[PDB]
Design a protein around this ligand. Structure first.
Ligand SMILES: Nc1ncnc2c1ncn2[C@@H]1O[C@H](COP(=O)(O)OP(=O)(O)OP(=O)(O)OP(=O)(O)OP(=O)(O)OC[C@H]2O[C@@H](n3cnc4c(N)ncnc43)[C@H](O)[C@@H]2O)[C@@H](O)[C@H]1O
Ligand SMILES: [Zn+2]
Ligand SMILES: [Zn+2]
Ligand SMILES: [Zn+2]
Ligand SMILES: [Zn+2]
Length: 203
């Protein structure tokens, strides 16, 4: 099965994907996570991506498309999270899959308002040891667990990331609505309620 999670920065795509991964064996592909690790390691890929990620801009389609080619899991059910972000990326993904006689089964649009985006990301905390994701209010790290705030969760960068999302996702939504595989979910609900909508759409 191939799933795509679409949604604003902070919608909880990673949170949901990481739960399907551990509970139903899905292979979770988060282009943001993969790029962040490259940047941290200072590989050629990380050097190339750093400038965009720092400013809350999209990494160019050509680099992302090549990346997805390289990281595509050969086996297993896959969740693409934060990919595609443009129609060009979605077309490349649809072609890659078609060559394999696969398709995208479902596109889940995680809808939240801007206010909630800002709330979710500004309060987002990561255990740097494991990459586990917490939220200062909604899902705090337990006592004793040291956490950091991502540099790109700073207010100016969140705002740019949100802007780029609201602009670029419009044609992508249309693209998948045309195929009849898009399902909206209210991602403004608690994590458990969101997970349930997810399972409902895919089951
Ligand atoms: N394909 C692509 N093309 C071009 N560039 C690309 C690209 N992919 C990546 N990039 C580049 O890389 C950058 C980063 O990309 P990426 O990492 O993909 O950023 P994003 O999708 O905009 O958003 P997030 O990773 O921040 O949010 P999320 O939806 O996964 O929410 P999370 O589960 O963490 O949850 C957020 C917070 O909310 C909490 N939370 C989650 N759900 C709930 C809930 N239901 N209720 C209360 N709190 C919740 C969490 O604990 C957490 O604190 C981009 O800006 C771009 O530069
Ligand atoms: Zn994420
Ligand atoms: Zn073809
Ligand atoms: Zn703009
Ligand atoms: Zn199905």
């Amino acid at each position: 099965m191939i799933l795509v999670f679409l949604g604003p920065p902070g919608a909880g795509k990673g949170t949901q994907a990481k739960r399907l991964a551990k509970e139903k064996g899905f292979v979770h592909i988060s282009t943001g996570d993969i790029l962040r690790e490259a940047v941290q390691k200072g590989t050629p890929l990380g050097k190339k991506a750093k400038e965009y990620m720092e400013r809350g801009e999209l990494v160019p389609d050509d680099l992302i498309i090549a990346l997805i080619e390289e990281v595509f899991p050969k086996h297993g059910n896959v969740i693409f999270d934060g990919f595609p972000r443009t129609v060009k990326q979605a077309e490349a993904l649809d072609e890659m899959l078609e060559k394999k006689g696969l398709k995208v089964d479902h596109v889940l649009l995680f809808e939240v308002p801007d206010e909630v985006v800002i709330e979710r990301l500004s309060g987002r905390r990561i255990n740097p040891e494991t990459g586990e994701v917490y939220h200062v209010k909604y899902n705090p790290p337990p006592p004793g667990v040291k956490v950091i705030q991502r540099e790109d969760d700073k207010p100016e960068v969140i705002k740019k990331r949100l802007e780029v999302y609201r602009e670029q996702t419009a044609p992508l939504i249309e693209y998948y609505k045309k195929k009849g595989i898009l399902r909206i979910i209210d991602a403004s609900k608690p994590v458990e309620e969101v997970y349930r909508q997810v399972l409902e759409v895919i089951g």
